[PDB]
Amino acid sequence: AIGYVWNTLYGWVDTGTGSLAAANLTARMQPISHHLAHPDTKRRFHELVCASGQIEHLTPIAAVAATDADILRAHSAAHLENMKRVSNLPTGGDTGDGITMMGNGGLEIARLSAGGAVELTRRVATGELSAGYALVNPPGHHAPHNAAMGFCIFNNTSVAAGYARAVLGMERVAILDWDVHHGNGTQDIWWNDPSVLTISLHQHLCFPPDSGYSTERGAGNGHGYNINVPLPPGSGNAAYLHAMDQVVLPALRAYRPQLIIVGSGFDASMLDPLARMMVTADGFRQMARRTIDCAADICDGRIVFVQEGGYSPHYLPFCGLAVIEELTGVRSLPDPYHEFLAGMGGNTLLDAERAAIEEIVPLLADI
Template sequence: MRTVGYLWDSLYGWVDTGSGGFSPADPLAGLQPIAHHVAHPDTKRRFHEAVQVSALKEHLTFMQATAASDEDLLRVHTAEYVQRIKDQSTLAKGGDAGDGATPLGKNGFHIAALAAGGAMRATKAVVEGEVDCAYALINPPGHHAEAGQGMGFCLFNNVSVAIAYAREKLGIQRVAVVDWDVHHGNGTEAIWWDEPEVLTISLHQHLCYPPESGYRTTHPGALNIPLPPGSGNKVYELAMDTVVVPALRRFKPELIMVASGFDAAAMDPLARQMLTQRGFNALTESLMAVADEVCGGKVVFCQEGGYCPHYVPICGLGVLEVLTGHSSGFGDPFAEMLDPQGVDDLYEHQRVEVERAAELLAPKEY
């Protein structure tokens, strides 16, 4: 049985995304103010609260985050960018990380540094054997953030800050990132583009976000698997088994980081994929099986996106069920509604896209 670390901090639920629905409210653009921004932290807080009342609680090792230091952030981000976030953070009503759609509230820098620090804490625990694997339920997310710019609700690239820390301080060199957030992990890819000992793998809906990003690539340190809209459990499982798992076997990482978004789920408002809890469970099972094979099961899950307050907690519980080997006691209360909607379909055009991604593996050394 695995020991599973778990990390949340109440301040992750205090991320202030403002009163806009997606971009800031603007009467001249027809964008009305609303209490719940699409990236409102309640979605992730509800995941944490579901954990608290589930039978999983007694099977998790609770850990506490401390904020990443400037030194930690600067391993990945430019000094200008870290200062920019600090400056925006001092404004009376907060500011934005760079693209006009990545809000942070007053003193939001502190929560962003705490999210990066949470990823570091979970990584340290796994690398040093305090736990076998870990789930860091951190917020704000990180995978779109580049060295010198935040975007897509992401301030600091939490996964990358943790990888850089592990490589400098924990004696780890080869790290693979498996990013199953529905959007392309562009920031993580860009940060490690020139580092052949860090492989970034991204499964995402083709051209969902960012624009013109995440095409299939033959770059040695990056493997992109763009999937057509409407891809459900069987499509993602095929991609995991025929592309991601062989790539990990070939790359032989010492540690796997999962950029764990739940926005590829069938109820998410920001994408058009069809995963259900069952699909996330299957992805987790495949991933942990190959992790046991190549890196002693050392896997750190870091929360990324996921915008359906109803379904994110259910998908998250599913992942934790697989990691702990115990039932949450809840199952998937949405399965009865979602299962008849084609969530397990695998169409030819979807199979072809997965096969094309698999072809990239053939002659390359990862």
């Protein structure tokens, strides 16, 4: 039984009229219909889940709006109050960083995004479902305890982990973030806390420009329980799989989480505008397969995927579908881009990629 969350409102997120920041006439930044983070990319993934017939092998789970209490397990009261303020504006507004628009009433959608993660987690942890995929929007992993950042309003995977900890009574949860950008928000939230192992694979200094170094290991009781794996631009399937086998899977095995939450972004894809990585749908497939098999071995299969970034409306749907196919074990479609992208490379481990990953292996000893 594989759960699947989509809510119509995930596709209604108002990203405004700019490309990244707001349109600005003096800067001569012309308005544009689709911001880089426009919801159509993720809606096209949902629609392919349905049109491919994959949906027939999934258990649809309705998102439930995250309550203030749910949000407050991950976030400060001032942050929540600030999001209520912006949401109430007649056209919404930027939430602080200059690139994170929330539309009017957009707090409703942020609540449903975090609540989609929580509701899936609840049903997987109870044993009602074996695993699932929450195709939420807006994304979460850049939002630290006290701010929105990098298109993220609330940290969905941390709201879910907080729920699993405080409500479900789980003692150890792992959040594995393979969105191409550093999960700085997740890192922040659990910085001092060994009860949530936070792992981020990312393009080094892609976003944020100042975090994600492997020296960022957590603090106090949390020291050794944050692991960053920064990778060079141009890394593809071979690098990502080398990181999975050499660092991620051993880290999870050492930690023995009771639940694995995957921050599942697809912006490491070969065709993504917001990073320079070379992962293809098959790469994501192999990453999902490895992680799911690890969950089966160490935590009774309890694994929940939660959508983070990804900015190719053309290709992201196939990358996403590949992961969902690994969850259901039922294949619906080939990746029609397979051959086209295969010729471009990324499928050979380069020495600089190997060196970046091997830097992290010594940190495993402290888990």
